Design an enzyme around this catalytic site. Structure first.
Site, PDB file in Angstrom:
ATOM      1  N   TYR B  26       0.717  -1.245   0.053  1.00  0.00           N
ATOM      2  CA  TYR B  26      -0.089  -0.101  -0.122  1.00  0.00           C
ATOM      3  C   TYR B  26       1.006   1.102   0.088  1.00  0.00           C
ATOM      4  O   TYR B  26       2.216   1.194   0.197  1.00  0.00           O
ATOM      5  CB  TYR B  26      -0.853   0.143   1.244  1.00  0.00           C
ATOM      6  CG  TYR B  26      -0.250   0.574   2.491  1.00  0.00           C
ATOM      7  CD1 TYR B  26       0.801  -0.161   2.920  1.00  0.00           C
ATOM      8  CD2 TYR B  26      -0.692   1.662   3.348  1.00  0.00           C
ATOM      9  CE1 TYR B  26       1.273   0.104   4.273  1.00  0.00           C
ATOM     10  CE2 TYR B  26       0.021   1.879   4.288  1.00  0.00           C
ATOM     11  CZ  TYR B  26       1.074   1.179   4.983  1.00  0.00           C
ATOM     12  OH  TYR B  26       1.455   1.763   5.935  1.00  0.00           O
ATOM     13  N   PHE B  36       1.354  10.463   4.499  1.00  0.00           N
ATOM     14  CA  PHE B  36       1.914  10.005   5.870  1.00  0.00           C
ATOM     15  C   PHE B  36       2.259   8.571   6.245  1.00  0.00           C
ATOM     16  O   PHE B  36       2.481   8.379   7.174  1.00  0.00           O
ATOM     17  CB  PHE B  36       0.590  10.339   6.614  1.00  0.00           C
ATOM     18  CG  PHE B  36      -0.318   8.980   6.782  1.00  0.00           C
ATOM     19  CD1 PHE B  36      -1.263   8.684   5.464  1.00  0.00           C
ATOM     20  CD2 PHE B  36      -0.614   8.258   7.735  1.00  0.00           C
ATOM     21  CE1 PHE B  36      -1.905   7.427   5.432  1.00  0.00           C
ATOM     22  CE2 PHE B  36      -1.444   7.165   7.667  1.00  0.00           C
ATOM     23  CZ  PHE B  36      -2.221   6.791   6.703  1.00  0.00           C
ATOM     24  N   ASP B  37       2.334   7.802   5.069  1.00  0.00           N
ATOM     25  CA  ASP B  37       2.726   6.441   5.256  1.00  0.00           C
ATOM     26  C   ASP B  37       2.991   6.177   3.667  1.00  0.00           C
ATOM     27  O   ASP B  37       2.694   6.576   2.821  1.00  0.00           O
ATOM     28  CB  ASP B  37       1.944   5.643   5.813  1.00  0.00           C
ATOM     29  CG  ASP B  37       2.260   4.400   6.501  1.00  0.00           C
ATOM     30  OD1 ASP B  37       3.228   3.793   5.923  1.00  0.00           O
ATOM     31  OD2 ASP B  37       2.131   4.330   7.769  1.00  0.00           O
ATOM     32  N   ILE B  56      -6.709  -1.337  12.028  1.00  0.00           N
ATOM     33  CA  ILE B  56      -7.853  -0.622  12.005  1.00  0.00           C
ATOM     34  C   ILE B  56      -8.961  -1.415  10.918  1.00  0.00           C
ATOM     35  O   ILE B  56      -8.464  -1.812   9.896  1.00  0.00           O
ATOM     36  CB  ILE B  56      -8.087   0.937  11.551  1.00  0.00           C
ATOM     37  CG1 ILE B  56      -7.181   1.061  10.415  1.00  0.00           C
ATOM     38  CG2 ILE B  56      -7.462   1.560  12.912  1.00  0.00           C
ATOM     39  CD1 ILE B  56      -7.563   2.315   9.418  1.00  0.00           C
ATOM     40  N   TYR B  82      -8.551   6.693  13.733  1.00  0.00           N
ATOM     41  CA  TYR B  82      -8.169   7.074  14.920  1.00  0.00           C
ATOM     42  C   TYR B  82      -9.150   8.030  15.535  1.00  0.00           C
ATOM     43  O   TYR B  82      -9.196   8.173  16.692  1.00  0.00           O
ATOM     44  CB  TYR B  82      -6.787   7.538  15.022  1.00  0.00           C
ATOM     45  CG  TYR B  82      -5.574   6.529  14.465  1.00  0.00           C
ATOM     46  CD1 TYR B  82      -5.161   5.863  15.216  1.00  0.00           C
ATOM     47  CD2 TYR B  82      -5.250   6.788  13.060  1.00  0.00           C
ATOM     48  CE1 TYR B  82      -4.295   4.898  14.502  1.00  0.00           C
ATOM     49  CE2 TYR B  82      -4.216   6.076  12.461  1.00  0.00           C
ATOM     50  CZ  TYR B  82      -3.804   5.052  13.351  1.00  0.00           C
ATOM     51  OH  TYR B  82      -2.869   3.977  13.027  1.00  0.00           O
ATOM     52  N   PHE B  99      -5.808   5.654   0.401  1.00  0.00           N
ATOM     53  CA  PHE B  99      -4.813   4.530   0.238  1.00  0.00           C
ATOM     54  C   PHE B  99      -4.848   3.896  -0.982  1.00  0.00           C
ATOM     55  O   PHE B  99      -5.836   3.512  -1.595  1.00  0.00           O
ATOM     56  CB  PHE B  99      -5.230   3.396   1.511  1.00  0.00           C
ATOM     57  CG  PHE B  99      -5.161   3.822   2.775  1.00  0.00           C
ATOM     58  CD1 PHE B  99      -3.677   3.656   3.557  1.00  0.00           C
ATOM     59  CD2 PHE B  99      -6.084   4.523   3.559  1.00  0.00           C
ATOM     60  CE1 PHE B  99      -3.437   4.037   4.588  1.00  0.00           C
ATOM     61  CE2 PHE B  99      -5.801   4.649   4.942  1.00  0.00           C
ATOM     62  CZ  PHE B  99      -4.578   4.347   5.370  1.00  0.00           C
TER      63      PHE B  99
END
Lengths: 421, 107, 52, 241
Positions: B26, B36-37, B56, B82, B99
């Site tokens: 991903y 962020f990732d 999650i 979150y 994503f």
């Protein structure tokens, strides 16, 4: 009519190359008719016609010639690669000529020698350039090394044209002389449009054309003799962006003082246009102003809430994104977000108010003028409005509007935080 | 919810099951496109099973709503992510998510 | 060619060894410049040395 | 107290700071100029196709780039780097724009869904067609001859624009214009024209890379000076009247 040019249908075929005029075509598509026309007008000389051409010195009417200054890309090298001592030399070929001048700059739109931060001389005119005009040397054309060079200790600036050391009216080698080093001097190349150059700092002494003549034996160095790397270059750019605080303009001032206030304004005839972008996005119905002096349109202003993208600082006014959803049909749908004034004043008539909650109403002086859009996914903004005036006191600048830029809540009084410039 | 969108699907049939390590590569994102990732730069494909409550539930529901070989553009919400607490130091409160998921295998 | 270089360099060198400085040279060059200031033998010496 | 304060400085996060390295791309165009001034118009309906082979990240990140949706150069220029829209120095960058890449129009990083069945990227062996629509903007493309509806309104066509293509690395495709060089597998529909009609004399038309400042120069560093366009005067051909 649309003879074979009906763009929708073209009921009748056999479009041809002739539809674009004889500027495209030539005598191959004109030999049949032009010979008859020339025989006819030769017999009209037989009548005794008298007509001299309009665009000649004899019938003096050719008065539509003038220079066109635009995109004078001042090529350069890095400031970090500057030099403040020793003898240096670098070659520069040329594919054309024109308004095209090179030499040595200093770290500091204004072309070479207009101010006291660059030394150079042209080939279009063969004249020095440092804070004025001064004849020197000789012109050139294609295939002509210029070979500028300095001796930084004793200030011997020279230009070696294929071994030819160029001299002034007095016949002296040293074109420029008696310059303080200060922050060093870096190479530089200016080029008007439809002019071309190609430089070779020190990358290969083999690639250097004429350096053994007048560069090697004199103790004069290349620029990139030691550098095992691509020495870098950069240039005066096209788009405007935000980097600097002027405080030294024609006459415009910056301060802050209490509703808020600042101190600003010029007197020179600002026929042209200006720029602005506040440094700090401040945050601590929502009435807060941004005042500008020329009110009741000394010059007709054009207020528009606008995003980052621009490309123009000229008089191209009233030349400024919509969702239109299909359903496998072509008929549009869901077109609510689409396209993602002319009045303000300060002194004569008014001011320019902000508003917030999504919800926005930018209108001047408390009078309804039918604001249309309320479109914002997200737009970071500091204020930047730009226009003309007749130059009376030419500019100014004044919870509340200081509420929708940062995480705290709307609150009226903005407090002391050491940066406000 | 997981408003799934596809990018370059494959078979559209090989959906995942219980006890199946979804081997993902991903590349997460945030609204306003602030990344962020990732996993493409690590060259370390993710691995997680279904029902173990490791991740999650957005990724789990997106995998259950996904076939093999299926590049996708998932879209979670604060309800599954979150929330108003937010992951501290990275995620702010009440943040939607994006994503660029790409499932490869199951073991 | 270095042979031609030595050919043109020797005569100018013998010239410059005598034409370095002279008060008679100064007065005669002043009279000649006022009639027609010494000739630029250093300039031609430099022009020869730039080739050599 | 250090661990207290270290864990206290972090979760502010408006203090915290962001960077994002980006793939290096570059535009391209043919030698055609649009040049359509109103008053002596020639063809307000053009058509050309593009054919592709490979779009793979063989040793790269998969975050690649391929678009054909026209951009406002009144809004954009051919530069190698810059812009607050995460760079991506290619087509559809400027906010007054869109971009067709198989599935969506990312209007300056604003995803806008396009209406088309069988949504997928510009994958291997998939043709991409173009058309023209000015007086009421609904500018059409198609992929393998299938309805790409929901076309775009209110993109600024106040005047003209420029013809474009953008690509990142790991790419191998082919233009299609006409003659031998266009093997049109989907013909011009009604009221259109295979866009090789302005093949002007003095040169065979070819690519230009969007008036680049300097290519990969090797001999020395060539300061290839300002050539603003085909005409320093304007951007327009001359119907003599």
């Amino acid at each position: 009519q649309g003879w074979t040019y009906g763009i929708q249908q073209d009921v009748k075929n056999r479009r041809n190359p002739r539809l674009v005029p004889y500027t495209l075509l030539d005598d191959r598509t004109k030999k049949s008719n032009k010979d008859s026309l020339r025989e006819a007008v030769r017999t009209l000389l037989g009548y005794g016609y008298h007509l001299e051409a309009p665009d000649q010195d004899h019938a003096s009417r050719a008065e539509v010639c003038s220079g066109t200054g635009e995109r004078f890309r001042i090529f350069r090298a890095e400031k970090t690669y500057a030099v403040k001592a020793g003898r240096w030399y670098f070659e520069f070929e040329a594919v054309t000529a024109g308004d095209m001048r090179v030499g040595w700059s200093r770290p500091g739109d204004l072309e070479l020698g207009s101010d006291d931060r660059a030394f150079a001389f042209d080939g279009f005119k063969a004249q020095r350039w440092h804070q004025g005009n001064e004849h020197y040397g000789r012109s050139w054309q294609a295939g002509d090394v210029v070979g500028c060079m300095v001796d930084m200790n004793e200030h011997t600036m020279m230009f070696t044209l294929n071994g030819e050391i160029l001299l002034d009216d007095s016949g002296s080698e040293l074109a420029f002389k008696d310059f303080d080093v200060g922050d060093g001097f870096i190479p530089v190349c200016s080029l008007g449009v439809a002019q071309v150059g190609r430089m070779n700092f020190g990358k290969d002494v083999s690639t250097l054309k004429y350096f053994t003549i007048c560069g090697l034996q004199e103790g004069y160095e290349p620029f990139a003799v030691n550098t095992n790397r691509d020495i870098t270059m950069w240039l005066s750019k096209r788009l405007p962006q935000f980097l600097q605080v002027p405080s030294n303009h024609e006459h415009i001032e910056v301060t802050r003082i209490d509703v808020t206030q600042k101190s600003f304004g010029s007197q020179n005839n600002n026929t042209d246009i200006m720029f602005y972008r506040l440094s700090m996005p401040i945050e601590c119905t929502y009435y807060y102003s941004v005042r500008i002096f020329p009110g009741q349109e000394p010059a007709n202003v054009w207020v528009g809430w606008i995003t980052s993208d621009f490309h123009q600082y000229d008089t191209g006014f009233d030349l400024d994104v919509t969702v239109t959803l299909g359903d496998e049909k072509g008929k549009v749908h869901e077109s609510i977000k689409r396209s993602n004034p002319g009045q303000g004043r300060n002194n004569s008539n008014g001011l320019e108010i902000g508003c917030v909650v999504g919800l926005l109403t930018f209108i001047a002086n408390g009078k309804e003028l039918s604001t249309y859009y309320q479109v914002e996914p997200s737009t970071k903004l500091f204020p930047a409005v730009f226009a003309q005036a007749t130059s009376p006191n030419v500019f100014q600048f004044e919870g509340l509007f200081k509420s929708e830029h940062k995480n705290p809540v709307p609150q009226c009084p903005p407090r002391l935080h050491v940066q406000f410039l | 919810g997981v408003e799934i969108e596809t990018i370059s699907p494959g078979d559209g049939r090989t959906f995942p099951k219980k006890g199946q390590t979804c081997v993902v590569h991903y590349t997460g994102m945030l609204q306003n496109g602030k990344k962020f990732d990732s996993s493409r730069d690590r060259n370390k494909p993710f691995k997680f099973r279904i029902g173990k409550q490791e991740v999650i539930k957005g990724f789990e529901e997106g995998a259950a709503q996904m076939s093999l070989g299926q590049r996708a553009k998932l879209t979670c919400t604060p309800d599954v992510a979150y929330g108003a607490t937010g992951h501290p130091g990275v995620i702010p409160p009440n943040a939607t998510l994006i994503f660029d998921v790409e499932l490869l295998n199951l073991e | 060619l270095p042979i031609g270089l030595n050919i043109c360099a020797p005569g100018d060198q013998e010239l410059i060894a005598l034409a370095k400085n002279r008060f008679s040279l100064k007065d005669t060059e002043e009279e000649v410049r006022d009639i027609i200031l010494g000739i630029a033998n250093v300039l031609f010496h430099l022009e020869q040395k730039s080739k050599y | 107290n250090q661990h207290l304060i270290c864990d206290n400085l972090l979760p502010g996060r408006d203090l915290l700071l962001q960077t994002r390295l980006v793939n290096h791309v570059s535009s391209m165009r043919p030698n055609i100029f649009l040049g359509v001034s109103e008053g002596s118009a020639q063809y307000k309906k053009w058509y050309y196709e593009l054919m592709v082979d490979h779009t793979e990240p063989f040793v790269t990140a998969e975050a690649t780039h391929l678009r054909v949706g026209w951009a406002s150069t009144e809004g954009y220029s051919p530069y190698p780097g810059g812009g607050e829209e995460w760079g991506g120095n290619g087509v559809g960058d400027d906010l007054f724009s869109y971009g067709f890449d198989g599935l969506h129009l990312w209007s300056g990083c604003i995803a806008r869904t396009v209406s088309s069945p069988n949504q997928h990227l510009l994958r291997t062996d998939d043709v991409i067609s173009c058309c023209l629509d000015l007086s009421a903007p609904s500018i059409s493309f198609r992929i393998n001859g299938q309805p790409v509806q929901g076309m775009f309104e209110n993109f600024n066509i106040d005047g003209l624009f420029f013809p474009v293509v953008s690509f990142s690395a790991g790419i191998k495709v082919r233009f299609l214009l006409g003659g031998r060089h266009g093997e049109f597998k989907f013909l011009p529909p009604p009221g259109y024209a295979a866009c090789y009609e302005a093949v002007l004399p003095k040169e065979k038309l070819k690519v230009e890379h969007s008036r680049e400042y300097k290519q990969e120069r090797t001999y020395t560093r060539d300061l290839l000076g300002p050539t603003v366009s085909l005409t320093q005067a304007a951007f327009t051909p001359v119907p003599v009247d």
